[PDB]
Design a protein around this ligand. Structure first.
Ligand SMILES: CCc1ccc(/C=C2\SC(N[C@@H](c3ccc(F)cc3)c3nnn[nH]3)=NC2=O)o1
Length: 559
């Protein structure tokens, strides 16, 4: 029951890898302590392998099965449709990994005959063959972090032709089933403000609120063949075309359950018997499996009035405190139950009685004040990683622009507004690229977004309050200030000055550019403006922006 097996061949890169933070003429204006930023490479792949390789044990009891039966009952009310080849193709990221069969993402998106014919042939093979394991590629991810160094994460994905077939058979499923099965507990259905709203309204729902987060040690490796088959049983509960049932069955047996691992050089690196992190069902499956195990675990632990919030492998639980002593005991029972379900904790879960002290999805609730001085809750997080990546993206263009995604997701925060917005808008203006669409990711899906639309986008996801928040909490203030000292980032005084400069230059531009200056940097001037709803803000089609998670799902969308 080992998560993985290895032949000994090394996980190889498909291009030159940089470890040290690239430096340019802009670097210092943001960060001085360059040696604290690094990017993980294949060189550490070996360390990760040893961490994610272990034997799994599972003891499923009646609570587990009772929760599963309930989940299947909700799942049966779901009706999913097969996606056409064209539809699935249009969902393919312009820069997705090219197929090993003579065509790439560009060919897929343009519906080239070669790409369509191969896709159709792969689809046919899935319907006729439900046994032969599908090949996958294992790569060491290149991610940027701040020191104090972690080994590179691994990514396992099948060929482009297969990814397109996954979409056809399961896109509609993984996009709609989770919300029906888990209801208000499915986190990807909420925007940042909606997630904060759900957490506060839930916290208040309890007379004696108590909450905690649960971090499973390498969740993907804890997923057993049973878990993957259980997820399939849930999918099959949906009303599906017979052709889709066969495709989902086949993908489960040949890909999801496990298969061979091939490095970028074509050598067999080993075999996988756990969750593949680079497939379409990675997010939905982890969310379903985490919710199933945690729900059953809550019962075993006898937690009162439990309200859960699940996002992939990230879990949040808010319930009725039965006392400080009893809570601690319950939590331990919960952990023991989770462990029996093959989901041991990486870090011991601790009970919190202060919402702001609960961190889930690397984030936490905090409070500030809007123009009217009213108390307003918002989602924030430790700026360290976001700032380390912003430095890298300062001297190196990357496939994913983390700074953009961070600005969109945490626009109300002190650090995103003061630093991220000021810094990158200054750069955009200098290169006159304000209107250039850039790629960023929201909940694992890729989106092409033009900086000039940030104002309208932020107003839609956070409301005008994001443009005028102030008097942040002492806790948040200290955490940001510490980060800035650690990384060597200029003080507010400096950023405010740079913001006025950027703001003035934007206003001169006019059009949307001026809108960016007026709204994004109204906090910089001494005499703030009124700031009213943006007209074109209703034209934006953010329908599929916050519906589900697609981490590793190879999903694309054009705004
Ligand atoms: C990171 C270290 C730090 C210094 C001061 C604070 C706390 C601040 S600044 C602020 N408001 C200003 C602001 C500065 C930068 C921003 F990005 C937003 C708001 C502001 N001026 N005019 N309107 N609002 N409110 C607080 O509690 O944190």
């Amino acid at each position: 029951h080992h998560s993985y097996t290895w032949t000994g061949a090394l996980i190889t890169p498909c291009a030159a890898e940089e470890s040290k933070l690239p430096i340019n003429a802009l670097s210092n204006s943001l960060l001085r302590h360059h040696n604290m930023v690094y990017a993980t490479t294949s060189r550490s792949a070996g360390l990760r392998q040893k961490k994610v390789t272990f034997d799994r044990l599972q003891v499923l009891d009646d609570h587990y099965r009772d929760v599963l039966k309930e989940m299947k009952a909700k799942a049966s009310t779901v009706k999913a449709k097969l996606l056409s080849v064209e539809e699935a193709c249009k969902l393919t990221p312009p820069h997705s990994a090219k197929s090993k069969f003579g065509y790439g993402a560009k060919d897929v998106r343009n519906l080239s005959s070669k790409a369509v014919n191969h896709i159709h042939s792969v689809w046919k093979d899935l319907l006729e063959d439900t046994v032969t394991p599908i090949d996958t590629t294992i790569m060491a991810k290149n991610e940027v972090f701040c020191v104090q160094r972690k080994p590179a994460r691994l990514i396992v994905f099948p060929d482009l032709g297969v990814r397109v077939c996954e979409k056809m058979a399961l896109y509609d499923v993984v996009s709609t089933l989770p919300q029906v099965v888990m209801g208000s507990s499915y986190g990807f259905q909420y925007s940042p403000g909606q997630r904060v709203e759900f957490l506060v309204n839930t916290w208040k729902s309890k007379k004696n609120p108590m909450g905690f987060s649960y971090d499973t040690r390498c969740f993907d490796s804890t997923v057993t063949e049973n878990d993957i088959r259980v997820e399939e049983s849930i999918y099959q509960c949906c009303d599906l075309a017979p052709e889709a049932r066969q495709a989902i069955k086949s993908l489960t047996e040949r890909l999801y359950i496990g298969g061979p691992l091939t490095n970028s050089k074509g050598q067999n690196c080993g075999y996988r018997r756990c969750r593949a992190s680079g497939v379409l069902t990675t997010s939905c499956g982890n969310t379903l499996t985490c919710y199933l195990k945690a729900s059953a675990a809550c019962r075993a632990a006898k937690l009162q009035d439990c309200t859960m919030l699940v996002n992939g492998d990230d879990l949040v639980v808010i319930c009725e405190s039965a006392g400080v002593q009893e809570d601690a005991a319950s939590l331990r029972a919960f952990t023991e139950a989770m462990t029996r379900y093959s989901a041991p904790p990486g870090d011991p879960p601790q009970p919190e009685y202060d919402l702001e002290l609960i961190t889930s999805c690397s984030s936490n609730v905090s409070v500030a004040h809007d123009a009217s001085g009213k108390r307003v809750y918002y989602l924030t997080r430790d700026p360290t990683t976001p700032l380390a990546r912003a430095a890298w993206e300062t001297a190196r263009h990357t496939p994913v622009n983390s700074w953009l995604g961070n600005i969109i997701m945490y626009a109300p925060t002190l650090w995103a507004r003061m630093i991220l917005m000021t810094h990158f808008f200054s750069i955009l203006l200098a290169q006159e690229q304000l209107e250039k669409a850039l790629d960023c990711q929201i909940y694992g899906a890729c989106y092409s977004i033009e900086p000039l639309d940030l104002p309208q986008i932020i107003e839609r996801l956070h409301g005008l309050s994001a443009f005028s928040l102030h008097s942040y909490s002492p806790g948040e203030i200290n955490r940001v200030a510490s980060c800035l000292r650690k990384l060597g980032v200029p003080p507010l005084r400096v950023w405010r000055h740079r913001a006025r400069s950027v703001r003035a230059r934007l206003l001169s531009q006019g059009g949307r550019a001026a809108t960016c200056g007026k709204y994004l940097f109204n906090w910089a001037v001494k005499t703030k403006l009124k700031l009213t709803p943006i007209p074109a803000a209703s034209q934006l089609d953010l329908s599929g922006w916050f519906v589900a998670g697609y981490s590793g799902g190879d999903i694309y969308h054009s705004l």
